[PDB]
Amino acid sequence: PILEKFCFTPHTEEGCLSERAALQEELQLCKGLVQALPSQQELPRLLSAACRLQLNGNLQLELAQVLAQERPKLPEDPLLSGLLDSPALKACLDTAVENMPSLKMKVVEVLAGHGHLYSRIPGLLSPHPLLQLSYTATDRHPQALEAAQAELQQHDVAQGQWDPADPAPSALGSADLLVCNCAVAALGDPASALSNMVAALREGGFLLLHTLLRGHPLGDIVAFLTSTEPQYGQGILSQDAWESLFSRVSLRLVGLKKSFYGSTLFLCRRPTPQDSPIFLPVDDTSFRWVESLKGILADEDSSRPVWLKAINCATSGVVGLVNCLRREPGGNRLRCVLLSNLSSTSHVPEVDPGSAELQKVLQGDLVMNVYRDGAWGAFRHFLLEEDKPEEPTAHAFVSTLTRGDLSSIRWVCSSLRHAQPTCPGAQLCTVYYASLNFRDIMLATG
């Protein structure tokens, strides 16, 4: 079985990877070499080689090319691909999948050869049982991404010839989701590439963009490097620079995921033609709102989106209601807004049409808009940790978790922790040395 956890997820989060210890050590290593102009990781080795040839007046040429760095191993560096291995990628992909009028998803990757997302993205969508995915990876040159062609084949992907700078090919046409991995890939120009992508992006689609932010320590460090290649430097931009860049192409930022050192992950949704939205209260306890909603959904001719908003009670289950309604005919109009605060001291934002928050969520236009404890977010599914739970216990018994295999033998908590069976004529005894007999081997062996 697929084991998951149903967790709340803020739309905008900061300091995602701060918990990781290895990433902090990597940042310390990279800044140490940067200081005064050391690890098995590729990026610290690259900086060590840059400092090695010259402590001063280093050739941009010599640091740029060096053995063990010609490979695109930077994306394999934990610092650069930290967020992708984090749950932020899964949350963004779930957000993209959820807000689709159809059950099929069309995703295209730009500069896929360097991005390498083609290997990682398709796996994360396997847990969705009904989702059907059509993946296509595009890179500037045919020889680019020539390696790993078997890795592409094992997944249901297609090659590409699109270079983002030029207008998108008609073959890609309209796609639900665009993934770039701009952190490692090189874009000719930010505004031009964004214009081309938004041209390729369908109406109401999503643009998932991964970038390193300028003005941050690691951002400045990468800015110093790759100075030989101007295109990569243009990819590195300020957070406000990216925010302004999105607006110019009329692309609205639905969500943002940021790392503690500076690596960030942008998610944007192409605006859809503004339509007057219906409003229906869904907090009535008598459930008489079903008839009112039943009538509205009946008029399938109307294309007005319908907003079910519950604000009276945090326990209202409108989330599942809209989840089930969307599948049924005429469900494309449904969109949810719920205010569920778990703390009384927390305040409730106003959802009046005049108020700003409702306008902002309408502009975002996401199906799920759940506000809890001062942050707009939506519930998401994450695979839970594989390791079995363990706790300190005074009572435990040796058990073979899998019959017939000795490698499984491990200590497990014992029912004696409760000691209810103890009674007069029976007593509990500590065990210092426990012997093994033939029958024990026969049992463990299976």
Short mmCIF file of C-alpha atoms in Angstrom, two decimals:
data_model
loop_
_atom_site.label_atom_id
_atom_site.label_comp_id
_atom_site.label_asym_id
_atom_site.label_seq_id
_atom_site.Cartn_x
_atom_site.Cartn_y
_atom_site.Cartn_z
CA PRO A 1 0.00 0.00 0.00
CA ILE A 2 0.92 3.64 -0.54
CA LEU A 3 1.23 5.29 2.88
CA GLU A 4 0.78 9.06 3.09
CA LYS A 5 -0.04 11.88 5.49
CA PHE A 6 -2.67 14.57 4.90
CA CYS A 7 -0.98 17.79 5.99
CA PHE A 8 -1.72 21.49 5.80
CA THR A 9 0.59 23.44 3.48
CA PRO A 10 1.01 27.24 3.47
CA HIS A 11 1.08 28.72 -0.01
CA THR A 12 4.19 30.79 0.81
CA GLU A 13 6.91 29.37 3.06
CA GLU A 14 10.39 30.47 4.10
CA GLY A 15 13.43 28.67 5.46
CA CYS A 16 12.32 25.34 4.04
CA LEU A 17 15.61 23.42 4.31
CA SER A 18 16.93 25.02 7.51
CA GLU A 19 16.48 21.72 9.39
CA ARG A 20 18.99 19.89 7.19
CA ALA A 21 22.45 19.77 8.76
CA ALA A 22 24.43 18.72 5.68
CA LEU A 23 23.17 21.73 3.74
CA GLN A 24 24.35 24.09 6.48
CA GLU A 25 27.80 22.48 6.45
CA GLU A 26 27.89 22.82 2.66
CA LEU A 27 27.04 26.51 2.97
CA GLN A 28 29.78 26.95 5.57
CA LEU A 29 32.28 25.25 3.25
CA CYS A 30 31.27 27.35 0.24
CA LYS A 31 31.44 30.63 2.16
CA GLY A 32 34.78 29.67 3.70
CA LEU A 33 36.38 29.37 0.27
CA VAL A 34 34.55 32.52 -0.84
CA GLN A 35 36.07 34.27 2.16
CA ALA A 36 39.67 35.12 1.27
CA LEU A 37 38.66 34.60 -2.36
CA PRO A 38 37.15 20.85 1.19
CA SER A 39 34.23 18.46 0.71
CA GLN A 40 33.19 15.46 -1.35
CA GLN A 41 30.43 17.60 -2.87
CA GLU A 42 31.06 18.97 -6.34
CA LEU A 43 30.37 22.65 -5.65
CA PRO A 44 32.88 23.02 -2.77
CA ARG A 45 35.43 21.22 -4.94
CA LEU A 46 34.73 23.66 -7.78
CA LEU A 47 35.28 26.62 -5.47
CA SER A 48 38.41 24.97 -4.05
CA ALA A 49 39.77 24.59 -7.59
CA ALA A 50 38.88 28.21 -8.34
CA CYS A 51 40.85 29.34 -5.28
CA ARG A 52 43.61 26.79 -5.96
CA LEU A 53 45.02 28.18 -9.20
CA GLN A 54 45.26 31.76 -7.91
CA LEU A 55 44.48 33.40 -4.59
CA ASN A 56 44.22 36.69 -6.51
CA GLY A 57 43.49 37.62 -10.11
CA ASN A 58 42.09 34.14 -10.92
CA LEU A 59 41.35 33.57 -14.64
CA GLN A 60 37.53 33.45 -15.12
CA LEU A 61 38.62 30.91 -17.81
CA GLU A 62 40.55 28.62 -15.37
CA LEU A 63 37.89 28.44 -12.57
CA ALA A 64 35.14 27.90 -15.24
CA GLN A 65 36.70 24.67 -16.66
CA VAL A 66 38.39 22.09 -14.43
CA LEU A 67 38.46 18.32 -14.13
CA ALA A 68 35.50 16.84 -12.20
CA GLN A 69 33.40 19.96 -12.95
CA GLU A 70 32.79 19.74 -16.71
CA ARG A 71 30.05 17.28 -15.80
CA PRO A 72 26.66 18.82 -14.95
CA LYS A 73 27.20 17.62 -11.38
CA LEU A 74 26.20 20.99 -9.89
CA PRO A 75 22.49 19.98 -9.97
CA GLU A 76 23.64 16.88 -8.09
CA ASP A 77 25.18 19.20 -5.50
CA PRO A 78 22.91 19.18 -2.42
CA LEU A 79 22.87 22.98 -2.15
CA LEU A 80 21.49 23.56 -5.65
CA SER A 81 18.95 20.71 -5.73
CA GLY A 82 18.05 20.90 -2.04
CA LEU A 83 14.49 22.12 -2.54
CA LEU A 84 13.74 19.58 -5.27
CA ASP A 85 14.50 16.76 -2.83
CA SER A 86 12.39 18.58 -0.23
CA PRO A 87 8.59 18.27 -0.01
CA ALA A 88 8.16 21.70 -1.64
CA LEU A 89 8.33 20.16 -5.12
CA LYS A 90 5.62 17.64 -4.24
CA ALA A 91 3.37 20.36 -2.81
CA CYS A 92 3.76 22.52 -5.92
CA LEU A 93 3.09 19.56 -8.22
CA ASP A 94 -0.01 18.65 -6.20
CA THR A 95 -1.23 22.24 -6.48
CA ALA A 96 -0.70 22.14 -10.25
CA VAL A 97 -2.45 18.78 -10.64
CA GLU A 98 -5.44 19.72 -8.49
CA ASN A 99 -6.36 22.84 -10.49
CA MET A 100 -6.94 21.15 -13.84
CA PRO A 101 -10.36 21.09 -15.56
CA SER A 102 -9.45 17.70 -17.08
CA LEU A 103 -8.06 14.54 -15.51
CA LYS A 104 -5.09 14.42 -17.92
CA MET A 105 -1.94 16.50 -17.39
CA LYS A 106 0.38 17.78 -20.12
CA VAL A 107 3.78 18.86 -18.80
CA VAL A 108 6.73 20.15 -20.85
CA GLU A 109 10.24 20.84 -19.57
CA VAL A 110 12.46 23.65 -20.86
CA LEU A 111 16.24 23.15 -20.94
CA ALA A 112 15.53 19.62 -19.73
CA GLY A 113 19.02 18.35 -20.50
CA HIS A 114 20.55 20.40 -17.69
CA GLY A 115 17.45 20.59 -15.51
CA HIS A 116 17.22 16.80 -15.04
CA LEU A 117 13.68 17.25 -13.70
CA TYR A 118 12.51 14.69 -16.27
CA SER A 119 13.96 12.01 -13.98
CA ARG A 120 12.35 13.30 -10.77
CA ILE A 121 8.96 14.83 -11.66
CA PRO A 122 7.25 11.74 -13.18
CA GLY A 123 7.88 9.60 -10.11
CA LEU A 124 6.21 12.06 -7.76
CA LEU A 125 2.96 11.79 -9.75
CA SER A 126 2.77 7.99 -9.53
CA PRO A 127 0.86 8.11 -6.20
CA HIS A 128 -2.06 9.76 -8.00
CA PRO A 129 -4.18 6.75 -9.04
CA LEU A 130 -6.23 8.22 -11.90
CA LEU A 131 -3.82 10.89 -13.17
CA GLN A 132 -2.49 10.23 -16.67
CA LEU A 133 0.68 12.11 -17.58
CA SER A 134 2.21 13.15 -20.90
CA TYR A 135 5.79 14.33 -20.37
CA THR A 136 8.03 15.98 -22.96
CA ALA A 137 11.59 17.19 -22.37
CA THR A 138 12.97 19.99 -24.55
CA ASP A 139 16.53 21.31 -24.78
CA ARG A 140 18.37 23.74 -27.02
CA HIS A 141 20.51 21.29 -29.00
CA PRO A 142 19.83 17.70 -30.12
CA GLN A 143 23.13 16.48 -28.68
CA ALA A 144 22.21 18.12 -25.38
CA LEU A 145 20.41 15.50 -23.27
CA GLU A 146 21.72 12.77 -25.59
CA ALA A 147 22.94 10.98 -22.47
CA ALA A 148 20.37 9.22 -20.27
CA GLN A 149 18.16 8.48 -23.30
CA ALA A 150 17.42 5.11 -21.68
CA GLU A 151 16.36 6.97 -18.54
CA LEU A 152 13.97 8.97 -20.71
CA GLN A 153 12.67 5.76 -22.29
CA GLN A 154 11.94 3.99 -19.00
CA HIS A 155 9.58 6.89 -18.34
CA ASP A 156 6.84 7.92 -20.77
CA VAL A 157 8.62 11.03 -22.08
CA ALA A 158 9.32 12.58 -25.47
CA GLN A 159 12.37 14.42 -26.77
CA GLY A 160 12.36 18.05 -27.81
CA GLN A 161 14.16 20.61 -29.96
CA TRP A 162 12.72 23.81 -28.46
CA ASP A 163 15.15 26.51 -27.36
CA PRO A 164 13.28 28.73 -24.86
CA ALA A 165 14.56 32.00 -26.34
CA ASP A 166 12.77 31.47 -29.66
CA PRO A 167 8.97 31.19 -29.89
CA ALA A 168 7.64 27.89 -28.63
CA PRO A 169 6.97 25.22 -31.29
CA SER A 170 3.38 24.44 -32.20
CA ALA A 171 3.92 20.76 -31.32
CA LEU A 172 4.09 21.63 -27.62
CA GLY A 173 1.22 24.06 -28.13
CA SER A 174 -0.75 24.44 -24.91
CA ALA A 175 0.48 22.59 -21.82
CA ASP A 176 -0.82 22.51 -18.26
CA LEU A 177 2.57 22.80 -16.54
CA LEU A 178 5.99 24.17 -17.53
CA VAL A 179 9.06 23.11 -15.55
CA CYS A 180 12.45 24.75 -16.07
CA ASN A 181 15.01 24.14 -13.30
CA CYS A 182 16.49 27.53 -14.17
CA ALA A 183 18.91 27.23 -11.23
CA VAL A 184 21.27 25.04 -13.26
CA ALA A 185 20.00 25.71 -16.79
CA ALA A 186 21.02 28.82 -18.73
CA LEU A 187 18.33 31.12 -20.16
CA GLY A 188 19.14 33.64 -22.86
CA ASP A 189 17.09 36.39 -21.21
CA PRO A 190 14.61 36.42 -18.30
CA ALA A 191 11.87 38.54 -19.88
CA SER A 192 12.19 36.94 -23.32
CA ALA A 193 12.14 33.38 -21.97
CA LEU A 194 9.18 34.17 -19.71
CA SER A 195 7.29 35.70 -22.64
CA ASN A 196 7.94 32.60 -24.76
CA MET A 197 6.87 30.28 -21.94
CA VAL A 198 3.66 32.19 -21.20
CA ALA A 199 3.01 32.05 -24.94
CA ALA A 200 3.37 28.26 -24.76
CA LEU A 201 1.38 27.98 -21.52
CA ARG A 202 -2.33 27.22 -21.83
CA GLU A 203 -4.98 29.46 -20.32
CA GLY A 204 -5.23 28.87 -16.59
CA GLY A 205 -2.10 26.71 -16.66
CA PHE A 206 0.88 26.72 -14.33
CA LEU A 207 4.55 27.66 -14.74
CA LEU A 208 6.79 25.94 -12.19
CA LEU A 209 10.15 27.72 -12.11
CA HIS A 210 13.19 26.89 -9.96
CA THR A 211 15.75 29.66 -9.56
CA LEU A 212 18.54 30.90 -7.31
CA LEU A 213 18.01 34.39 -5.88
CA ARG A 214 20.53 37.20 -6.24
CA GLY A 215 21.39 39.34 -3.24
CA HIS A 216 21.78 36.19 -1.12
CA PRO A 217 25.06 34.59 0.04
CA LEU A 218 24.90 31.55 -2.22
CA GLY A 219 23.44 33.79 -4.92
CA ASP A 220 26.45 36.10 -4.79
CA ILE A 221 28.77 33.08 -4.71
CA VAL A 222 27.28 31.67 -7.90
CA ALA A 223 27.31 35.17 -9.40
CA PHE A 224 31.08 35.31 -8.94
CA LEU A 225 31.37 31.93 -10.66
CA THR A 226 30.11 31.18 -14.18
CA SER A 227 31.12 34.72 -15.13
CA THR A 228 32.48 33.15 -18.32
CA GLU A 229 28.92 32.28 -19.35
CA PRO A 230 26.73 35.42 -19.37
CA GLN A 231 23.50 33.45 -19.85
CA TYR A 232 23.79 31.70 -16.49
CA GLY A 233 24.44 35.02 -14.77
CA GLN A 234 21.23 36.41 -16.24
CA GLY A 235 19.40 33.44 -14.74
CA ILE A 236 20.56 34.62 -11.31
CA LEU A 237 18.27 37.50 -10.39
CA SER A 238 16.90 39.28 -7.34
CA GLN A 239 13.67 38.16 -5.70
CA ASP A 240 12.11 41.54 -6.44
CA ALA A 241 13.58 41.29 -9.95
CA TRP A 242 11.74 38.00 -10.49
CA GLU A 243 8.55 39.42 -8.96
CA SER A 244 8.65 42.36 -11.38
CA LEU A 245 9.51 40.01 -14.26
CA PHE A 246 6.39 37.92 -13.65
CA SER A 247 4.08 40.95 -13.79
CA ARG A 248 5.44 42.16 -17.13
CA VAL A 249 4.31 38.90 -18.76
CA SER A 250 0.95 39.12 -16.96
CA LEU A 251 1.81 35.97 -14.99
CA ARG A 252 0.49 35.83 -11.43
CA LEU A 253 2.50 34.25 -8.59
CA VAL A 254 0.22 31.76 -6.85
CA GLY A 255 2.86 30.26 -4.56
CA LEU A 256 6.49 30.52 -3.52
CA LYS A 257 8.87 28.13 -1.77
CA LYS A 258 12.16 29.45 -0.39
CA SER A 259 15.21 27.82 1.16
CA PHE A 260 17.10 29.16 4.16
CA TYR A 261 20.26 29.92 2.17
CA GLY A 262 18.44 31.43 -0.81
CA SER A 263 17.45 28.74 -3.29
CA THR A 264 13.78 29.26 -4.13
CA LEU A 265 11.05 27.61 -6.20
CA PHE A 266 8.49 29.74 -8.04
CA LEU A 267 5.00 28.61 -9.03
CA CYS A 268 2.91 30.83 -11.31
CA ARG A 269 -0.52 30.45 -12.90
CA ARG A 270 -1.46 32.06 -16.21
CA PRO A 271 -4.47 34.37 -15.70
CA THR A 272 -7.80 33.17 -17.06
CA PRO A 273 -10.41 35.50 -18.64
CA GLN A 274 -11.99 37.40 -15.77
CA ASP A 275 -15.54 36.22 -15.09
CA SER A 276 -18.12 37.30 -12.55
CA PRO A 277 -17.94 34.67 -9.77
CA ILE A 278 -20.98 33.24 -8.03
CA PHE A 279 -21.04 33.15 -4.23
CA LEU A 280 -22.93 30.53 -2.22
CA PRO A 281 -22.89 30.12 1.59
CA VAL A 282 -22.15 26.52 2.56
CA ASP A 283 -22.20 26.76 6.38
CA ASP A 284 -25.94 26.26 6.91
CA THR A 285 -26.50 23.34 9.27
CA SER A 286 -29.81 22.31 7.68
CA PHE A 287 -27.97 21.41 4.43
CA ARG A 288 -30.62 23.37 2.53
CA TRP A 289 -27.71 24.95 0.64
CA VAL A 290 -27.56 21.70 -1.34
CA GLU A 291 -30.71 22.67 -3.24
CA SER A 292 -29.33 26.14 -4.01
CA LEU A 293 -26.04 24.64 -5.17
CA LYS A 294 -27.93 21.87 -6.99
CA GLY A 295 -29.75 24.49 -9.05
CA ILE A 296 -26.60 26.47 -9.87
CA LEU A 297 -24.68 23.40 -11.03
CA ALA A 298 -27.72 22.41 -13.11
CA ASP A 299 -27.36 25.44 -15.41
CA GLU A 300 -24.33 23.99 -17.17
CA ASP A 301 -24.81 26.62 -19.89
CA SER A 302 -23.48 29.32 -17.58
CA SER A 303 -19.68 29.39 -17.45
CA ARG A 304 -19.45 31.49 -14.28
CA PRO A 305 -17.18 29.89 -11.66
CA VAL A 306 -18.97 29.05 -8.42
CA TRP A 307 -17.30 29.75 -5.06
CA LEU A 308 -18.40 27.64 -2.09
CA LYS A 309 -17.19 29.57 0.96
CA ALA A 310 -17.67 28.47 4.57
CA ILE A 311 -16.53 30.83 7.32
CA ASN A 312 -18.80 30.03 10.27
CA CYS A 313 -17.26 26.72 11.36
CA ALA A 314 -13.74 25.32 11.07
CA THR A 315 -15.15 21.77 11.04
CA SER A 316 -17.11 22.25 7.81
CA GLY A 317 -16.10 19.56 5.33
CA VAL A 318 -16.41 21.65 2.17
CA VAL A 319 -12.96 20.45 1.08
CA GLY A 320 -14.12 16.89 0.47
CA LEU A 321 -17.37 18.20 -0.98
CA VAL A 322 -15.56 20.13 -3.70
CA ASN A 323 -13.12 17.25 -4.18
CA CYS A 324 -16.00 14.90 -5.03
CA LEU A 325 -18.08 17.48 -6.92
CA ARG A 326 -15.31 18.36 -9.39
CA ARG A 327 -15.37 14.88 -10.94
CA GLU A 328 -19.11 15.06 -11.63
CA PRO A 329 -20.43 16.90 -14.70
CA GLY A 330 -20.41 20.66 -14.30
CA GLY A 331 -17.84 20.45 -11.50
CA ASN A 332 -15.30 22.64 -13.28
CA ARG A 333 -17.01 25.71 -11.81
CA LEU A 334 -16.53 24.69 -8.17
CA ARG A 335 -13.96 26.53 -6.06
CA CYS A 336 -13.59 26.41 -2.28
CA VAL A 337 -12.78 28.91 0.48
CA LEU A 338 -12.56 27.74 4.10
CA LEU A 339 -11.42 29.49 7.29
CA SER A 340 -10.31 26.81 9.77
CA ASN A 341 -8.35 28.19 12.72
CA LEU A 342 -7.18 25.70 15.36
CA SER A 343 -6.32 28.41 17.92
CA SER A 344 -8.95 30.62 19.53
CA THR A 345 -6.45 33.44 20.03
CA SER A 346 -5.98 33.47 16.25
CA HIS A 347 -8.07 36.05 14.41
CA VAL A 348 -10.29 35.47 11.37
CA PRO A 349 -9.80 37.43 8.13
CA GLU A 350 -12.83 38.96 6.45
CA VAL A 351 -14.13 37.25 3.30
CA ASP A 352 -16.52 40.03 2.25
CA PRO A 353 -16.30 40.69 -1.51
CA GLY A 354 -15.13 44.22 -0.76
CA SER A 355 -12.32 43.02 1.49
CA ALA A 356 -8.90 42.50 -0.06
CA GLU A 357 -8.25 38.86 0.85
CA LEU A 358 -11.14 37.51 -1.21
CA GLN A 359 -9.93 39.58 -4.16
CA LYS A 360 -6.40 38.20 -3.82
CA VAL A 361 -7.58 34.59 -3.67
CA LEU A 362 -9.87 35.22 -6.65
CA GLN A 363 -6.90 36.57 -8.60
CA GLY A 364 -4.95 33.46 -7.65
CA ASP A 365 -7.96 31.36 -8.69
CA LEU A 366 -6.97 28.14 -6.92
CA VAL A 367 -9.62 25.53 -6.16
CA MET A 368 -8.51 25.07 -2.54
CA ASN A 369 -8.14 28.21 -0.39
CA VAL A 370 -7.91 27.16 3.27
CA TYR A 371 -6.79 29.74 5.82
CA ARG A 372 -5.46 28.47 9.15
CA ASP A 373 -3.53 30.27 11.88
CA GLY A 374 -2.58 33.27 9.79
CA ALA A 375 -1.59 31.63 6.50
CA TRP A 376 -3.50 30.80 3.32
CA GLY A 377 -2.89 27.22 2.26
CA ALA A 378 -4.38 23.93 1.14
CA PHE A 379 -4.27 20.36 2.41
CA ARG A 380 -1.72 18.17 0.63
CA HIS A 381 -0.64 14.52 0.57
CA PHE A 382 2.95 13.62 1.45
CA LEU A 383 4.46 10.15 1.65
CA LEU A 384 5.41 9.51 5.27
CA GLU A 385 8.82 8.36 6.46
CA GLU A 386 9.73 4.77 5.66
CA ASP A 387 11.57 3.99 8.90
CA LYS A 388 9.46 2.20 11.49
CA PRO A 389 8.80 4.18 14.69
CA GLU A 390 10.88 3.42 17.78
CA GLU A 391 10.69 4.52 21.40
CA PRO A 392 12.64 3.85 24.61
CA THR A 393 11.03 1.00 26.53
CA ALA A 394 12.05 -1.04 29.57
CA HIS A 395 10.10 -4.08 28.33
CA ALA A 396 10.87 -5.51 24.89
CA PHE A 397 11.04 -8.91 23.21
CA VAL A 398 13.15 -10.16 20.32
CA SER A 399 10.97 -10.75 17.27
CA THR A 400 11.51 -11.74 13.64
CA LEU A 401 9.60 -9.03 11.79
CA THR A 402 9.62 -11.21 8.65
CA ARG A 403 9.37 -14.96 9.15
CA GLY A 404 12.23 -16.97 7.68
CA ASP A 405 14.82 -14.16 7.44
CA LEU A 406 17.27 -13.64 10.29
CA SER A 407 18.23 -10.17 9.04
CA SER A 408 14.79 -8.95 10.16
CA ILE A 409 15.25 -9.95 13.83
CA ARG A 410 14.83 -6.78 15.89
CA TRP A 411 13.73 -5.79 19.38
CA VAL A 412 10.07 -4.80 19.72
CA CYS A 413 8.01 -3.30 22.52
CA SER A 414 6.45 -5.85 24.86
CA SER A 415 2.91 -6.21 26.18
CA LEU A 416 4.42 -6.45 29.67
CA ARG A 417 4.65 -2.64 29.71
CA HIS A 418 1.10 -2.72 31.11
CA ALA A 419 1.64 -5.70 33.46
CA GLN A 420 -2.10 -6.35 33.75
CA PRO A 421 -1.72 -10.18 33.50
CA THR A 422 0.34 -10.12 36.71
CA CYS A 423 -1.61 -11.61 39.61
CA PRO A 424 -0.98 -13.60 42.79
CA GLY A 425 0.72 -16.84 41.83
CA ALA A 426 2.46 -15.11 38.91
CA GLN A 427 5.35 -12.65 39.14
CA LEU A 428 7.42 -10.46 36.84
CA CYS A 429 11.16 -11.15 36.62
CA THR A 430 13.97 -9.21 34.98
CA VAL A 431 16.02 -11.06 32.36
CA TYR A 432 19.81 -10.73 32.45
CA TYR A 433 20.95 -13.63 30.25
CA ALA A 434 18.48 -15.35 27.92
CA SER A 435 19.50 -18.64 26.34
CA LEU A 436 18.88 -19.85 22.79
CA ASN A 437 17.75 -23.41 22.07
CA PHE A 438 17.19 -25.46 18.93
CA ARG A 439 13.49 -24.58 18.81
CA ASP A 440 14.33 -20.86 18.68
CA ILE A 441 16.47 -21.41 15.59
CA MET A 442 13.73 -23.53 14.03
CA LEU A 443 11.18 -20.77 14.64
CA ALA A 444 13.38 -17.94 13.38
CA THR A 445 14.49 -19.96 10.35
CA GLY A 446 10.82 -20.55 9.54
#
